[PDB]
């Protein structure tokens, strides 16, 4: 009936991602009890058979909320710049035999490290989301998001940056997500804190 | 249960619609794999047997994405201009005996030809969407949309027009969705192009004589 | 296995809430045929066993549309002011021992009386909504809403006040939702009307000193 056993269940991406065209880092998870399905069906219209289509890549340590949507397959065959958006080429009717293929790639959808995707946000094809970003709930993300940026609304718009500029530089330098597991245990208390200038030296001195 | 067998499955509306108050043109289709239900349950609160309610009318060659919503039954009995929006008339309670019917109709929801309605868009009661319009995904459409206009956001607002004013007028005179099917089969390459000028000249030489 | 019988079936909240941390007033009803589930699953991430968590309080005579969402559990353990939004504390992996709890409560979500919550609206944690308010369909409510204020969009913003300042203060003072049943029953016509001042003057004469 329901993939998730409880509303607070958070199952890792790699544990449930079966689509070969979906690339997830470890520890990233999706908690979708309230929509009933595994992460595969958050990723819409991604052919598992082909290697010419746009791919979805998600980094490590991401948190994805229930009913988030990753729209793939570009324009789905609709060319708004042609006379008609109706996709003749893909409809079965002999009257449509001379139709042209309106499908166009958008590029891959790139989801960086440590990014928080709010429940029921929708990510449009070919969006790039930088490290440490926050997509508010119900956002409709139509443009790239810069690292540690917070966006929300429909369409998604700049709300704020999580940290100061020199602080974002510091975090993208050490890139804590790339560290070995034995190392993470030790800086955990600094990670669960605001002391950005602080942890910048424990990585630097070592 | 999923009505559709694959995400790319798109069934013509006239194959799945059962509600006598839903009127759909040829070739229009709904691809609702990701919301499970067939197109009927896209049309919310439409009494299927009464003949005195707002109807949903959809033209031909329309593309409707998954979980699109068409809100019917007007204000559903809720009067914001009355002291309370609670619909006393429609709740079973002997103390609500002298309530008044707050139900108000909005008029038909009319979607024209060659309209693209994005996934999970919500159309409010009484909205008219003209030919060739595009409703971005997740739009909440609260007022009418002109021909060949693109709108999005919540509430939906103008994004752009697909073509120049002259070209829009040209397309509406041609009304290719109404052409004989032989003309449509012959024009299929032009229709999958931006060449309005050429196709309009080709139509005139066929239809002006 | 839908919980509601027809699209028009609105079931009183007090007849379908099991979470001890959801408290509902009389006559308030949820109308959720098009999302299938009972009202409990509208209220998300609300621990039902604990009493140190944010609670949901809903006045009487509220109308709640299908698939409305009430976000509880505050920030869910994600602290945007910490270096990482990833909730180490709640991740069960062995590496994450010296993790710290990032959960922060938002305070109770409070819905006054006579509130109309449009379908598929989402109320954020800790939000208070005053009596007589209207939340438009698909609203994302991030801020408090005043009595008899109409809001909508994502995030929700002021649209209008339903009535004048005088009329609103009259309504908050007379508090018709708290009236004995017999007063409610005999005022049913006035309530299905816009004559606040007239009702106010009657309420004064029946209730003063
Ligand atoms: C929960 C989060 C962390 C995902 C987002 O909330 P925060 O980033 O903590 O928002 P914060 O409380 O710092 O700031 C409030 C602002 O965020 C905006 N905001 C918060 N959540 C959302 C949302 N889901 N959609 C749109 N805007 C939002 C509010 O509109 C508000 O803007 P203001 O500057 O007009 O007040
Ligand atoms: C279900 N019920 C319905 O569909 C009903 O038609 C209703 C009650 C939702 C209609 O809402 P009402 O508040 O009664 O409409 P009313 O005519 O008073 O308000 C019109 C204004 O509300 C705004 N509005 C209406 N619905 C929405 C919405 N979902 N989101 C944002 N704004 C909205 C309109 O933009 C308009 O203002 P504007 O012209 O300045 O932009
Ligand atoms: N099913 C579906 O997925 C249907 C989806 N339909 C679509 O959204 C189409 O792909 C469209 C509308 C993007 C096609 O239009 P295009 O001309 O390709 O859009 P283009 O990128 O040129 O438009 C730029 C503007 O449209 C806005 N936009 C694009 N999609 C959306 C959307 N779903 N909701 C709101 N705004 C949108 C962009 O934010 C930008 O607006 P801004 O400059 O005010 O920020
Ligand atoms: Cl929205
Ligand atoms: Cl939605």
XYZ file of C-alpha atoms and ligand atoms in Angstrom:
748
model
C 0.000 0.000 0.000
C 2.523 2.603 1.188
C 6.258 2.422 0.522
C 7.161 4.215 3.759
C 6.297 2.520 7.027
C 5.708 5.727 9.031
C 5.404 9.491 8.412
C 8.875 10.074 9.846
C 10.508 7.374 7.724
C 13.519 8.550 5.741
C 14.837 5.937 3.312
C 18.127 6.550 1.442
C 18.013 7.315 -2.263
C 20.536 4.634 -3.282
C 18.444 2.163 -1.277
C 15.393 2.649 -3.528
C 16.608 4.236 -6.792
C 16.176 1.608 -9.514
C 16.351 3.838 -12.602
C 19.756 3.566 -14.336
C 19.496 7.204 -15.442
C 19.305 8.475 -11.828
C 22.576 9.212 -10.040
C 22.439 9.671 -6.259
C 25.081 10.124 -3.583
C 24.953 8.141 -0.394
C 23.155 9.264 2.787
C 20.823 11.410 0.673
C 17.232 10.366 1.381
C 13.591 10.927 0.451
C 10.791 10.840 3.050
C 7.573 10.431 1.093
C 5.093 8.672 3.385
C 2.401 11.193 2.466
C 2.570 10.399 -1.250
C 2.923 6.638 -0.921
C 5.578 5.922 -3.570
C 9.330 5.404 -3.697
C 11.723 8.015 -5.046
C 11.592 6.569 -8.586
C 8.193 8.146 -9.268
C 9.353 11.548 -8.053
C 11.420 11.521 -11.246
C 8.928 11.975 -14.049
C 9.236 10.886 -17.689
C 12.808 9.587 -17.466
C 13.283 6.684 -19.880
C 15.227 3.882 -18.129
C 16.096 2.322 -21.489
C 17.966 5.132 -23.264
C 21.283 6.927 -22.857
C 20.538 9.910 -25.134
C 18.059 11.536 -22.726
C 18.655 14.013 -19.895
C 19.864 12.538 -16.589
C 19.230 13.396 -12.934
C 22.228 13.674 -10.612
C 21.940 14.292 -6.857
C 24.858 14.730 -4.481
C 25.422 13.445 -0.965
C 23.685 14.502 2.250
C 20.538 15.792 0.535
C 17.121 15.821 2.191
C 14.132 15.463 -0.157
C 10.613 15.989 1.167
C 7.425 14.138 0.297
C 5.985 14.547 -3.185
C 8.914 16.478 -4.628
C 8.913 16.360 -8.425
C 11.855 16.159 -10.837
C 10.512 16.844 -14.328
C 12.635 15.145 -16.995
C 12.284 14.679 -20.786
C 12.653 18.360 -21.721
C 9.557 19.685 -23.487
C 7.842 16.265 -23.795
C 7.502 16.942 -27.521
C 5.602 20.239 -27.245
C 7.181 23.036 -29.283
C 5.678 26.309 -28.137
C 7.526 28.019 -31.012
C 5.773 25.884 -33.642
C 2.257 26.715 -34.805
C 0.756 23.993 -32.600
C 2.003 22.591 -29.293
C 0.033 19.402 -30.008
C 2.574 16.536 -30.366
C 1.470 15.000 -33.685
C 4.717 13.000 -34.007
C 3.892 11.013 -30.834
C 0.140 10.521 -31.409
C -0.934 7.442 -33.350
C -3.034 8.614 -36.309
C -2.180 7.992 -39.963
C -3.149 11.601 -40.733
C -0.033 12.591 -38.744
C 2.491 10.585 -40.792
C 4.508 13.602 -41.986
C 4.785 15.216 -38.535
C 8.136 16.419 -37.199
C 9.722 15.436 -33.892
C 9.384 18.360 -31.521
C 11.374 16.748 -28.721
C 14.354 18.778 -27.489
C 16.722 18.016 -24.608
C 17.080 20.558 -21.832
C 20.314 19.249 -20.364
C 20.709 17.289 -17.163
C 19.209 18.334 -13.827
C 22.116 18.815 -11.386
C 21.498 18.674 -7.628
C 24.560 19.481 -5.523
C 25.662 18.409 -2.062
C 23.819 19.193 1.195
C 20.719 20.635 -0.479
C 17.285 20.654 1.147
C 14.346 20.140 -1.240
C 11.055 21.057 0.405
C 7.915 18.957 0.208
C 5.982 19.141 -3.082
C 8.560 21.347 -4.769
C 8.776 20.819 -8.543
C 12.139 20.975 -10.346
C 11.929 21.875 -14.019
C 14.102 20.241 -16.718
C 17.777 21.184 -16.861
C 17.849 23.119 -13.568
C 21.187 23.337 -11.699
C 21.048 23.609 -7.906
C 24.294 24.481 -6.134
C 25.686 23.085 -2.914
C 23.899 23.824 0.326
C 20.823 25.360 -1.298
C 17.315 25.302 0.137
C 14.229 24.867 -2.043
C 11.208 25.925 0.017
C 8.049 23.838 0.001
C 5.792 24.092 -3.057
C 8.489 25.947 -4.989
C 8.406 25.690 -8.757
C 12.112 25.878 -9.646
C 12.556 27.174 -13.198
C 16.054 28.695 -12.906
C 19.397 27.640 -11.502
C 19.936 28.143 -7.758
C 23.327 29.256 -6.485
C 25.166 27.544 -3.601
C 23.661 28.122 -0.141
C 20.871 30.194 -1.709
C 17.340 29.962 -0.324
C 14.497 30.161 -2.853
C 10.719 29.822 -2.711
C 7.465 30.595 -4.558
C 6.060 29.842 -8.020
C 8.140 30.528 -9.948
C 10.964 30.219 -7.405
C 12.627 33.518 -6.511
C 15.603 34.581 -4.399
C 14.765 34.829 -0.699
C 18.186 34.986 0.982
C 21.634 33.451 1.265
C 22.206 31.080 4.174
C 25.624 32.516 5.029
C 27.793 35.506 4.232
C 29.864 35.533 1.050
C 33.254 34.782 2.610
C 31.538 32.041 4.605
C 30.149 30.375 1.475
C 33.640 30.511 -0.012
C 34.984 28.776 3.080
C 32.439 25.963 2.909
C 32.950 25.343 -0.803
C 36.690 25.174 -0.131
C 36.770 22.434 2.489
C 33.769 20.653 0.893
C 33.112 18.590 4.010
C 30.882 16.172 2.085
C 33.964 14.713 0.332
C 35.634 13.638 3.638
C 36.161 10.033 4.801
C 33.671 8.457 7.186
C 36.153 8.184 10.083
C 36.747 11.939 9.763
C 33.070 12.943 9.812
C 32.474 11.571 13.321
C 35.031 13.977 14.752
C 33.716 17.264 13.304
C 30.079 16.300 13.954
C 29.624 18.756 16.817
C 30.990 21.604 14.704
C 28.779 20.500 11.812
C 25.713 20.627 14.059
C 26.447 24.284 14.840
C 26.812 27.770 13.358
C 30.604 28.046 13.864
C 31.582 28.372 10.207
C 34.725 30.407 10.874
C 35.562 27.840 13.560
C 35.534 24.632 11.537
C 37.381 26.473 8.754
C 40.603 26.078 10.749
C 40.296 22.443 11.855
C 40.276 21.517 8.164
C 42.936 24.092 7.254
C 45.494 23.351 9.980
C 45.181 19.619 9.303
C -4.829 1.192 -9.641
C -3.345 3.233 -12.483
C -5.506 3.987 -15.512
C -2.356 4.499 -17.604
C 0.206 1.806 -18.354
C 3.267 4.068 -18.659
C 4.275 7.672 -17.901
C 4.298 8.407 -21.657
C 0.790 6.966 -22.080
C -1.641 9.563 -23.376
C -5.272 8.551 -23.854
C -7.650 10.714 -25.938
C -10.230 12.370 -23.700
C -13.124 10.987 -25.733
C -11.930 7.471 -24.812
C -12.085 7.946 -21.029
C -14.659 10.690 -20.318
C -18.020 9.463 -18.997
C -19.514 12.658 -17.494
C -22.269 14.031 -19.807
C -21.294 17.535 -18.683
C -17.738 17.170 -20.034
C -17.562 18.035 -23.742
C -14.277 17.255 -25.484
C -13.021 17.660 -29.017
C -11.181 15.164 -31.175
C -7.537 14.311 -30.504
C -7.329 16.059 -27.121
C -5.667 13.769 -24.589
C -4.707 13.423 -20.932
C -1.458 11.854 -19.725
C -2.155 11.231 -16.064
C 0.199 8.386 -15.191
C 1.589 10.229 -12.162
C -1.845 10.901 -10.652
C -3.357 7.486 -11.298
C -6.932 8.503 -12.078
C -8.585 8.888 -15.475
C -9.660 12.287 -16.765
C -13.084 12.289 -15.065
C -11.573 12.765 -11.624
C -9.652 15.773 -13.012
C -13.030 17.528 -13.220
C -13.889 18.257 -9.612
C -17.448 18.617 -8.286
C -19.282 18.280 -11.619
C -22.660 16.622 -11.042
C -22.777 14.062 -13.898
C -26.573 13.812 -14.164
C -27.888 17.330 -13.565
C -28.494 19.698 -16.472
C -28.458 22.986 -14.559
C -24.759 23.188 -13.575
C -21.690 24.732 -15.189
C -20.194 22.463 -17.863
C -16.569 21.912 -18.880
C -16.030 22.333 -22.631
C -12.635 21.476 -24.153
C -11.722 22.010 -27.795
C -9.747 19.734 -30.083
C -5.985 19.065 -30.234
C -5.469 19.925 -26.530
C -2.617 18.603 -24.353
C -3.485 18.061 -20.682
C -0.759 17.087 -18.237
C -0.936 14.826 -15.195
C -3.045 15.955 -12.253
C -4.500 18.976 -14.016
C -7.542 20.168 -12.068
C -10.718 21.766 -13.417
C -12.729 23.168 -10.493
C -16.486 23.110 -11.099
C -19.643 23.794 -9.002
C -18.839 27.510 -8.733
C -18.508 28.730 -5.151
C -19.591 25.336 -3.725
C -22.180 27.127 -1.585
C -19.645 29.428 0.137
C -20.585 33.132 0.141
C -17.682 35.343 1.165
C -20.064 38.314 1.084
C -22.271 36.616 3.684
C -21.511 36.830 7.388
C -20.316 33.205 7.386
C -18.779 31.150 4.598
C -19.926 27.965 6.309
C -22.565 26.430 3.984
C -25.411 25.882 6.448
C -27.745 25.001 3.551
C -25.716 21.919 2.536
C -25.127 20.386 6.003
C -27.668 18.027 7.583
C -28.734 19.690 10.840
C -32.246 20.558 12.055
C -30.918 23.859 13.451
C -29.927 24.981 9.947
C -33.531 24.780 8.754
C -33.969 28.444 7.743
C -30.634 28.707 5.898
C -30.434 30.245 2.405
C -28.818 28.598 -0.600
C -25.473 30.295 -1.075
C -24.705 28.347 -4.254
C -23.774 30.612 -7.175
C -22.728 29.456 -10.632
C -19.634 30.834 -12.355
C -20.640 29.964 -15.915
C -19.074 27.277 -18.092
C -15.324 26.635 -18.119
C -14.331 26.854 -21.806
C -10.988 25.689 -23.114
C -10.455 26.327 -26.814
C -8.528 24.503 -29.514
C -4.841 23.648 -29.421
C -4.398 24.523 -25.726
C -1.518 23.121 -23.666
C -2.387 22.758 -19.961
C 0.643 21.888 -17.862
C 0.797 19.229 -15.193
C -0.967 20.014 -11.906
C -2.405 23.315 -13.166
C -5.668 24.317 -11.482
C -8.403 26.025 -13.521
C -10.908 27.968 -11.452
C -14.663 27.922 -12.198
C -15.832 29.981 -15.155
C -12.449 30.548 -16.766
C -12.226 30.826 -20.573
C -8.925 29.848 -22.235
C -8.601 30.875 -25.857
C -7.155 28.913 -28.754
C -3.452 28.090 -28.712
C -2.845 29.233 -25.152
C -0.274 27.656 -22.867
C -0.873 27.120 -19.161
C 2.411 26.532 -17.376
C 2.638 23.669 -14.912
C 1.327 24.371 -11.405
C -0.493 27.496 -12.604
C -3.577 28.525 -10.651
C -5.736 30.095 -13.348
C -8.195 32.571 -11.847
C -9.066 34.703 -14.888
C -9.438 34.303 -18.634
C -6.509 33.681 -20.989
C -6.356 35.228 -24.472
C -5.534 33.216 -27.629
C -1.891 32.191 -27.938
C -1.097 33.698 -24.540
C 1.313 32.011 -22.116
C 0.560 32.349 -18.400
C 1.971 30.937 -15.190
C 2.297 31.272 -11.407
C -0.282 31.472 -8.613
C -2.369 33.354 -9.380
C -1.573 32.840 -13.075
C -0.272 35.990 -14.778
C 0.832 36.961 -18.277
C 4.201 35.587 -19.366
C 4.105 36.300 -23.122
C 2.290 35.727 -26.398
C 3.559 32.938 -28.643
C 3.341 35.046 -31.823
C 2.986 38.590 -33.105
C -0.452 40.209 -33.228
C -0.557 39.803 -37.017
C 0.348 36.101 -36.856
C -2.198 35.469 -34.083
C -4.929 36.985 -36.255
C -3.677 34.873 -39.188
C -3.939 31.638 -37.216
C -7.426 32.464 -36.013
C -8.712 33.120 -39.510
C -7.115 29.898 -40.792
C -8.558 27.825 -37.901
C -6.505 24.806 -38.944
C -8.180 22.673 -36.273
C -11.388 22.945 -38.348
C -9.796 22.123 -41.724
C -10.897 19.050 -43.686
C -8.748 16.142 -42.605
C -7.087 15.912 -46.031
C -5.915 19.518 -45.634
C -4.594 18.668 -42.177
C -2.679 15.612 -43.374
C -1.124 17.691 -46.200
C -0.070 20.530 -43.864
C 1.566 18.372 -41.203
C 5.146 19.532 -41.898
C 4.134 23.210 -41.941
C 2.151 22.727 -38.727
C 5.341 21.398 -37.096
C 7.160 24.659 -37.869
C 7.024 28.367 -37.078
C 6.153 29.229 -40.696
C 2.800 30.929 -40.181
C 3.230 33.286 -43.158
C 3.875 30.416 -45.567
C 1.031 28.268 -44.281
C -1.396 31.202 -44.353
C -0.505 31.895 -47.997
C -0.892 28.200 -48.764
C -4.306 28.252 -47.051
C -5.517 31.349 -48.910
C -4.663 29.833 -52.284
C -6.654 26.753 -51.220
C -9.569 28.518 -49.484
C -9.792 32.099 -50.856
C -10.616 30.908 -54.396
C -10.536 2.375 -0.774
C -11.608 6.017 -0.689
C -12.712 7.374 2.693
C -15.431 9.658 1.279
C -18.395 8.360 -0.696
C -19.010 11.163 -3.219
C -17.216 14.390 -4.151
C -19.821 16.374 -2.203
C -19.366 14.364 1.011
C -18.093 16.627 3.768
C -17.517 14.732 7.022
C -17.344 16.657 10.335
C -13.806 16.756 11.702
C -14.768 15.514 15.170
C -15.976 12.315 13.439
C -12.668 11.475 11.732
C -9.775 12.783 13.902
C -7.850 10.258 16.001
C -4.620 12.129 16.760
C -4.885 13.340 20.382
C -2.878 16.396 19.298
C -5.577 17.523 16.812
C -8.418 19.348 18.543
C -11.436 20.257 16.418
C -14.600 22.235 17.082
C -18.152 21.282 16.211
C -19.542 21.435 12.633
C -16.096 21.998 11.106
C -15.803 19.561 8.205
C -13.233 18.214 5.750
C -14.246 17.466 2.159
C -11.531 15.264 0.741
C -12.896 12.842 -1.860
C -10.286 13.881 -4.403
C -7.378 12.993 -2.119
C -8.948 9.841 -0.710
C -7.732 9.997 2.892
C -9.355 11.024 6.156
C -8.506 14.328 7.801
C -5.763 12.799 9.976
C -3.384 12.472 7.042
C -3.968 16.152 6.177
C -2.006 16.948 9.349
C 1.582 16.022 8.584
C 4.402 14.871 10.888
C 2.377 15.324 14.087
C 3.512 12.809 16.701
C 0.223 11.474 18.148
C 1.623 10.057 21.413
C 3.663 12.987 22.752
C 2.594 16.192 24.462
C 5.838 18.139 24.027
C 5.134 18.799 20.309
C 3.329 21.489 18.338
C -0.434 20.957 18.239
C -3.166 21.785 15.724
C -6.267 23.645 16.947
C -9.261 24.330 14.698
C -12.293 26.350 15.664
C -15.864 25.441 14.922
C -17.745 26.031 11.634
C -14.603 25.752 9.500
C -14.759 24.536 5.885
C -11.674 22.648 4.707
C -11.189 21.789 1.055
C -9.771 18.615 -0.394
C -6.098 17.901 0.206
C -5.431 20.890 2.444
C -2.060 20.407 4.180
C -1.183 21.344 7.782
C 2.567 21.157 8.323
C 3.558 20.245 11.875
C 6.812 19.141 13.541
C 8.261 22.637 13.116
C 11.560 22.560 11.238
C 11.657 18.726 11.189
C 15.198 18.801 12.548
C 16.607 20.886 9.684
C 18.464 23.979 10.905
C 19.191 26.331 8.011
C 21.491 28.330 10.320
C 23.742 25.310 10.911
C 26.491 24.390 8.431
C 24.374 21.559 6.990
C 20.602 21.173 6.698
C 21.093 17.397 6.677
C 19.567 16.041 9.943
C 22.509 14.045 11.267
C 20.796 13.525 14.631
C 17.928 11.583 13.045
C 20.107 9.603 10.659
C 20.623 6.194 12.207
C 24.080 5.433 10.771
C 26.827 4.514 13.234
C 29.139 7.343 12.157
C 26.710 9.984 13.431
C 27.063 9.532 17.199
C 28.187 12.983 18.367
C 25.311 14.509 16.375
C 23.154 17.186 18.024
C 19.368 17.546 17.823
C 18.369 20.315 15.401
C 14.629 20.108 16.019
C 13.060 23.460 16.934
C 9.330 23.828 17.602
C 7.316 26.520 15.834
C 4.457 26.738 18.322
C 0.850 25.677 17.834
C -0.971 26.046 14.506
C -4.267 27.768 15.411
C -7.322 28.000 13.138
C -10.088 30.233 14.469
C -13.819 29.798 13.943
C -15.640 30.221 10.643
C -12.470 29.808 8.569
C -12.641 28.683 4.956
C -9.513 26.794 3.859
C -9.397 26.287 0.102
C -8.493 22.978 -1.444
C -4.797 22.004 -1.618
C -3.677 24.939 0.525
C -0.643 24.346 2.778
C -0.425 25.906 6.257
C 3.143 26.213 7.529
C 4.044 25.370 11.157
C 3.226 27.839 13.900
C 0.793 29.851 11.768
C -2.295 31.384 13.400
C -5.407 32.121 11.297
C -8.060 34.415 12.756
C -11.821 33.935 12.826
C -13.705 34.460 9.562
C -10.620 34.243 7.353
C -10.504 32.802 3.832
C -7.458 30.920 2.526
C -7.618 30.656 -1.277
C -7.077 27.330 -3.001
C -3.393 26.394 -3.424
C -2.280 28.997 -0.894
C 1.045 28.441 0.856
C 0.502 30.211 4.173
C 3.785 31.290 5.725
C 2.521 34.150 7.907
C -0.339 34.818 10.302
C -3.719 35.805 8.825
C -5.906 38.412 10.567
C -9.628 37.960 11.379
C -11.781 38.096 8.229
C -8.723 38.634 6.014
C -8.613 37.028 2.572
C -5.210 35.783 1.396
C -3.816 33.679 -1.423
C -0.755 32.870 -3.546
C 2.613 31.271 -2.735
C 3.599 32.668 -0.319
C 0.159 33.919 0.739
C -0.341 37.693 0.684
C -3.164 40.046 1.616
C -5.977 40.192 -0.910
C -8.681 42.065 1.005
C -10.658 42.226 4.201
C -14.140 40.775 3.793
C -15.878 43.531 5.784
C -15.172 46.962 7.223
C -13.257 47.504 10.466
C -16.503 48.376 12.291
C -18.263 45.263 10.961
C -15.327 43.023 11.839
C -15.149 44.320 15.406
C -18.918 43.826 15.643
C -18.521 40.207 14.552
C -15.658 39.466 16.931
C -17.609 40.945 19.807
C -20.853 39.115 19.070
C -19.031 35.799 18.358
C -22.091 34.138 16.821
C -20.268 30.763 16.803
C -20.464 30.711 20.636
C -24.200 31.466 20.771
C -26.637 28.976 22.310
C -28.194 26.778 19.627
C -31.583 28.524 19.710
C -30.029 31.922 18.995
C -28.107 30.422 16.098
C -31.233 28.753 14.690
C -33.345 31.922 14.738
C -30.551 34.018 13.181
C -30.012 31.633 10.259
C -31.443 34.126 7.740
C -29.279 36.973 9.046
C -26.182 34.763 8.831
C -26.984 33.986 5.186
C -26.858 37.702 4.503
C -24.498 40.670 4.614
C -26.313 42.674 7.318
C -23.705 42.578 10.051
C -24.789 45.808 11.718
C -28.407 44.658 11.856
C -27.454 41.328 13.380
C -25.130 43.120 15.797
C -27.937 45.393 16.998
C -30.199 42.381 17.554
C -27.484 40.523 19.403
C -26.983 43.540 21.677
C -30.663 43.690 22.597
C -30.913 39.961 23.375
C -27.634 39.875 25.331
C -26.853 43.289 26.840
C -26.469 43.686 30.633
C 11.271 26.501 6.309
C 12.428 26.870 5.385
C 13.728 26.874 6.178
C 12.511 25.839 4.268
C 12.182 28.246 4.782
O 11.933 29.202 5.815
P 13.073 30.259 6.256
O 14.123 30.256 5.166
O 13.477 29.960 7.685
O 12.288 31.673 6.225
P 12.536 32.830 7.325
O 11.555 32.608 8.452
O 14.023 32.948 7.591
O 12.072 34.129 6.501
C 10.694 34.342 6.231
C 10.583 34.643 4.744
O 10.725 33.440 3.975
C 9.652 33.324 3.036
N 9.191 31.919 2.919
C 9.275 30.966 3.870
N 8.748 29.789 3.438
C 8.308 29.983 2.175
C 7.642 29.164 1.127
N 7.320 27.860 1.312
N 7.362 29.772 -0.042
C 7.669 31.063 -0.266
N 8.267 31.867 0.626
C 8.604 31.392 1.845
C 8.530 34.180 3.604
O 7.712 34.743 2.575
C 9.246 35.259 4.386
O 9.529 36.367 3.541
P 9.521 37.867 4.128
O 10.939 38.347 3.916
O 8.479 38.577 3.290
O 9.181 37.675 5.590
C -14.110 27.152 -4.610
N -14.598 28.518 -4.615
C -14.326 29.339 -5.629
O -13.785 28.956 -6.655
C -14.728 30.785 -5.489
O -14.896 31.347 -6.799
C -13.740 31.619 -4.652
C -14.403 31.911 -3.323
C -12.420 30.886 -4.435
C -13.515 32.983 -5.290
O -12.762 33.821 -4.404
P -13.304 35.268 -3.905
O -12.303 35.767 -2.885
O -14.762 35.129 -3.518
O -13.164 36.193 -5.235
P -13.294 37.812 -5.284
O -13.975 38.218 -6.572
O -13.834 38.309 -3.961
O -11.734 38.219 -5.409
C -11.108 38.585 -6.643
C -9.624 38.831 -6.362
O -9.057 37.699 -5.690
C -7.827 37.283 -6.298
N -7.722 35.794 -6.246
C -8.755 34.947 -6.421
N -8.372 33.649 -6.302
C -7.055 33.642 -6.034
C -6.031 32.594 -5.792
N -6.344 31.273 -5.814
N -4.772 33.011 -5.546
C -4.451 34.319 -5.520
N -5.322 35.320 -5.731
C -6.627 35.056 -5.992
C -7.894 37.838 -7.714
O -6.586 38.123 -8.228
C -8.768 39.082 -7.597
O -8.011 40.272 -7.339
P -7.230 41.150 -8.458
O -8.239 41.319 -9.573
O -6.872 42.439 -7.747
O -6.032 40.302 -8.821
N 3.572 19.573 -18.523
C 4.446 20.572 -18.454
O 5.530 20.472 -17.902
C 4.034 21.875 -19.094
C 5.085 22.920 -18.757
N 4.984 24.113 -19.570
C 5.945 25.022 -19.467
O 6.242 25.498 -18.381
C 6.659 25.371 -20.749
O 7.820 24.536 -20.866
C 7.113 26.828 -20.839
C 6.016 27.776 -20.373
C 8.374 27.004 -20.005
C 7.459 27.131 -22.290
O 7.742 28.523 -22.388
P 9.210 29.049 -22.793
O 9.077 30.150 -23.819
O 10.088 27.853 -23.071
O 9.617 29.707 -21.379
P 10.860 30.704 -21.140
O 11.905 29.984 -20.319
O 11.234 31.373 -22.442
O 10.128 31.773 -20.188
C 10.834 32.567 -19.245
C 9.838 32.971 -18.169
O 8.828 31.962 -18.023
C 8.733 31.597 -16.643
N 8.201 30.223 -16.432
C 8.526 29.114 -17.122
N 7.839 28.033 -16.664
C 7.047 28.449 -15.657
C 6.065 27.826 -14.732
N 5.778 26.502 -14.792
N 5.461 28.626 -13.826
C 5.733 29.942 -13.752
N 6.606 30.573 -14.554
C 7.287 29.894 -15.511
C 10.157 31.784 -16.147
O 10.246 31.871 -14.724
C 10.500 33.098 -16.811
O 9.808 34.135 -16.123
P 10.537 35.372 -15.393
O 11.458 35.952 -16.443
O 9.384 36.272 -15.014
O 11.231 34.731 -14.215
Cl 1.922 27.492 -6.171
Cl -0.125 20.178 -5.539
